[PDB]
């Protein structure tokens, strides 16, 4: 559970926003890419796993589950790649709500940024710092510190 | 001191590697860019501050310290922007040794990656997970969790 993340891919402005959610805290990292390829997904997971202790990734669709590039990054970084089948139907709901929240935030900041990539990083920052009480960024650090001790 | 980071810019392969170091832990984040501009530095700091609780950044040179785009990102993300004067001369030596270690790691992985940006992310991963005892990635989570508590 400290080590489990879920990938999620959403679209805006003709572009793709790739998101990784830390399931137990709701903390996220995200990037904008032109399209969702196994090479972009693989690089994104290499980045994530150098920054947090990623033990398991639930991939966002069958193409990234199948992709040998994605499997090669998960091998390199020590990540167990799994499917993203919502055996718990609560999962679909939580992701859909997160995409709608993020798109809302992105529209609230959208006029402060020329490029979408900026607005998306502003929305990561707002999402992770929002107190709902602790923020997601506080929860993920507490969860992992608890695990290390 | 849980909130204090230092920017560091190093060169390799005619390209620029921008690094942020969390001073109390040695944990790092890094990216490859074609050249160091205020806009690239500003975007990298927006990214860092959406991911960790960044209170103060010691800028890597006077042009990023002066840059109004870098100041606008620090204002946006709530970061106090400071100079990087090594009033402690040990600061100089710590950064030089970090750059030489990162470059060594990058040379050890360099033929597993077509692009330098992959090799740099592999080096971030190896650096942050290296046990020296705890890793940098363990230390930064412990430090921050202790602060939150």
């Amino acid at each position: 559970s400290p080590g489990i993340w879920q990938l999620d891919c959403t679209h805006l402005e003709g572009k793709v926003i790739l998101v990784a959610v830390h399931v137990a805290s709701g903390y996220i990292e995200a990037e904008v890419i032109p399209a969702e390829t196994g090479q972009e997904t693989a690089y994104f997971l290499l980045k994530l796993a150098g920054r947090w202790p990623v033990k398991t990734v639930h991939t966002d669709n069958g193409s990234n589950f199948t992709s040998t590039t994605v499997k090669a990054a998960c091998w390199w970084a020590g990540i167990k790649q799994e499917d993203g089948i919502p055996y718990n139907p609560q999962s679909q709901g939580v992701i859909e709500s997160m995409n709608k929240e993020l798109k809302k935030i992105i529209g609230q900041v959208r006029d402060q940024a020329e490029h979408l990539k900026t607005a998306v990083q502003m929305a990561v920052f707002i999402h992770n710092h929002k107190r709902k009480g602790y923020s997601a960024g506080e929860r993920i650090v507490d969860i992992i510190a608890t695990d290390i001790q | 001191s849980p909130g204090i980071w230092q920017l560091d810019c190093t060169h390799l392969e005619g390209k620029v590697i921008l690094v942020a170091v969390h001073v109390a832990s040695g944990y790092i984040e890094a990216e490859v860019i074609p050249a160091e501009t205020g806009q690239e530095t500003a975007y990298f700091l927006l990214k860092l501050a959406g991911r960790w609780p960044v209170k103060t950044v010691h800028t890597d040179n006077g042009s990023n310290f002066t840059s109004t785009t870098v100041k606008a990102a620090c204002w946006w993300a709530g970061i106090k922007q400071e100079d990087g004067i090594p009033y402690n001369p040990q600061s100089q030596g710590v950064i030089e040794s970090m750059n030489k270690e990162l470059k060594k790691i990058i040379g050890q992985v360099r033929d597993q990656a077509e692009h330098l940006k992959t090799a740099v992310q592999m080096a971030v991963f190896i650096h942050n997970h290296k046990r020296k005892g705890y890793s940098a990635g363990e230390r930064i989570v412990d430090i921050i969790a202790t602060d939150i508590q």
Binding site: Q39, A42, Y43, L46, T68, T69, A72, A73, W76 | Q112, A113, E114, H115, T118, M122
Partner: peptide
Amino acid sequence: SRKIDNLD
């Protein structure tokens, strides 16, 4: 290309 980022 026989690389992690270019398996070709």
